[PDB]
From Swiss-Prot:
Heme binds at C400. This is Bifunctional cytochrome P450/NADPH--P450 reductase. It comes from Priestia megaterium (strain ATCC 14581 / DSM 32 / CCUG 1817 / JCM 2506 / NBRC 15308 / NCIMB 9376 / NCTC 10342 / NRRL B-14308 / VKM B-512 / Ford 19). Changing A264Q: No effective fatty acid oxidation. No effect on electron transport from NADPH to FMN. Nearly wild-type level of high-spin conversion with laurate/dodecanoate, palmitoleate and arachidonate. Functions as a fatty acid monooxygenase. Catalyzes hydroxylation of fatty acids at omega-1, omega-2 and omega-3 positions. Shows activity toward medium and long-chain fatty acids, with optimum chain lengths of 12, 14 and 16 carbons (lauric, myristic, and palmitic acids). Able to metabolize some of these primary metabolites to secondary and tertiary products. Marginal activity towards short chain lengths of 8-10 carbons. Hydroxylates highly branched fatty acids, which play an essential role in membrane fluidity regulation. Induction: By pentobarbital. Expression is negatively regulated by repressor bm3R1 at the transcriptional level. This protein is a target of protein engineering. Its selectivity-directing and activity-enhancing mutations have been extensively studied and the designed mutations allow this enzyme to act on non-native substrates and/or in order to enhance production of synthetically desirable end-products. The record marks T268 as: Important for catalytic activity. (9Z)-hexadecenoate binds at Y51. Residues 1-456 are annotated as: Cytochrome P450. It is found in: Cytoplasm. Changing F393W: Large decrease in the heme reduction potential in the presence and absence of substrate arachidonate. 10% reduction in efficiency to couple NADPH consumption to substrate monooxygenation. In the N-terminal section; belongs to the cytochrome P450 family.
Length: 456
């Protein structure tokens, strides 16, 4: 019984594109979803996709025998500097499976034991920065979380120190990377890209790509020359061999993986830490519960890997922040073969689907009617959550390879913040979600009063 699907307002030849001509497209899509339901068609010039919001349909979309990851236009633009790294490659590209096989072990929960010391190094820098603020000062949350995540990924990724806490202006690589990502995201909403008015953007874009490649290529070359072995991903990549073929990743691909870790993990993880602190200061009883656990568990001057694993409630707080505002809000899929979705929507080979994660996470048939409330206790027993109901890290073999790294980092840092400071929402901050490739609470600021507990 084929059902025709909904579609928002069209604009002649422009189709639906004008509707995303806003600074907050995902939040706009969420409203369209509220209006049209679990599935709606969305067209742009020369493009068509279908946005899914219900767990019932998304669970079918997550069947890998039927759908595979699609490279959205955003990922195609990011590929200009992320290359055939894991995030911007097709599943069928030789280098995707090769890098996946080599890197998977280096990203397991067990492997986090090896990155822990480096994560603690940067976390201690963040805590010390806040301990050193004077009384009249405050904290710019996303800004400091981003300094932390970029530096942590640089240190664990290739033993390089961006030293973000020593600067007002970021290290040149960071400025170039951030500018390159911004340019890639800006191309999504510029009709006449060839307009000479964009010749300066193109020149700057090529310059930024060169800054990124030059630094990373240099570090790879310096490492191969010295023969030094470290606890970073670069050592794993220089020494790894794909079990299927016996081939190692070549230097160019290693460079793209390094750039990819920074691109894929810096903003998503800092956004998660920022949203989590936002929900905590807005819900004092929850912050109190989380602070009590941190004080009980983190009994040493420096957290150990095992202690971070015991911060169960902090982990629930992070999952609930990811439920409400998953920081990489949507992912794209294509139909591998002709198929019918949900018994009513026929699809043809190659047809695209978009999983709208914030909406999936607000499916009342799964979570209950109080979906807008921040309640970490929803994650008390993970086994009760239906398959494919909670997907902040994507799906299947193309799910986030950095999930254990991101959660270890976030749990460690949030635990240390809760152990060391009391927090004040001194401006009664009004949530304003800024959208780029990711989501974050723009302008979120707080004041942190030290509990004066030694940090080893
Ligand atoms: C809470 C923070 C994070 C979130 C929410 C997140 C989310 C995601 C999502 C949704 C995908 C799937 C994208 C798609 O289907 O197109 C993904 C892929 C990926 N993420 Fe993350 N991520 C986070 C942190 C990280 C970190 C810290 C790293 C690096 C240490 C990382 C590395 C990657 C890579 C390499 C892929 C592509 C994997 C593959 O396709 O083989 N992510 N991530």
């Amino acid at each position: 019984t084929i059902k025709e699907m909904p579609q928002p307002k069209t604009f002649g030849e422009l189709k639906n594109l004008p509707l995303l001509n806003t600074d907050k497209p995902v939040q706009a899509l969420m409203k369209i979803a509220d209006e049209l339901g679990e599935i709606f068609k969305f067209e742009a010039p020369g493009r068509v996709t279908r946005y899914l919001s219900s767990q019932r349909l998304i669970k079918e979309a997550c069947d890998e025998s039927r759908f595979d990851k699609n490279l959205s236009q955003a990922l195609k633009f990011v590929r200009d500097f992320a290359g055939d790294g894991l995030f911007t490659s097709w599943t069928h590209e030789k280098n995707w499976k090769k890098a996946h096989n080599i890197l998977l072990p280096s990203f397991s929960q067990q492997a986090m034991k090896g990155y822990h010391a480096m994560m603690v190094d940067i976390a201690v820098q963040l805590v010390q920065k806040w301990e050193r603020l004077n009384a009249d000062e405050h904290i710019e949350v996303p800004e400091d979380m981003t300094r932390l995540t970029l530096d942590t990924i640089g240190l664990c990724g290739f033993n390089y120190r961006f030293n973000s806490f020593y600067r007002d202006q970021p290290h040149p690589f960071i400025t170039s990377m951030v500018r390159a990502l911004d340019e890639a995201m800006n191309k999504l909403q510029r009709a006449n890209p060839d307009d000479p008015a964009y010749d300066e953007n193109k020149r700057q874009f090529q310059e930024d790509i060169k800054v990124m490649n030059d630094l990373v290529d240099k570090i790879i070359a310096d490492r191969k020359a010295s023969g030094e072995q470290s606890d970073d991903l670069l050592t794993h990549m220089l020494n790894g061999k794909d079990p299927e073929t016996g081939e190692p990743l070549d230097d160019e691909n290693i460079r793209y993986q390094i750039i990819t870790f920074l691109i894929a993990g810096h903003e998503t993880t800092s956004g998660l830490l920022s949203f989590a602190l936002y929900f905590l200061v807005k819900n004092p009883h929850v912050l109190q519960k989380a602070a009590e656990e941190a004080a009980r568990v983190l009994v040493d001057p420096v957290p150990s890997y095992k202690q971070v694993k015991q911060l169960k409630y902090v982990g629930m707080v992070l999952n609930e922040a990811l439920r409400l505002w998953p920081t990489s809000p949507a992912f794209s899929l294509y139909a591998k073969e002709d198929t019918v979705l949900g018994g009513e929507y026929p699809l043809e080979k190659g047809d695209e689907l978009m999983v709208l994660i914030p909406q999936l996470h607000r499916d009342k048939t799964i979570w209950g009617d109080d979906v807008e409330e921040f309640r970490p206790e929803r994650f008390e027993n993970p086994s009760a959550i239906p398959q494919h109901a909670f997907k902040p890290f994507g799906n299947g073999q193309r799910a986030c390879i950095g999930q254990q790294f991101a959660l270890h980092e976030a749990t460690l840092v949030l635990g240390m913040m809760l152990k060391h400071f009391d927090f004040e929402d001194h401006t009664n901050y009004e949530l304003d979600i800024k959208e780029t490739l990711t989501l974050k609470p723009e302008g979120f600021v707080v004041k942190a009063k030290s509990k004066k507990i030694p940090l080893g």
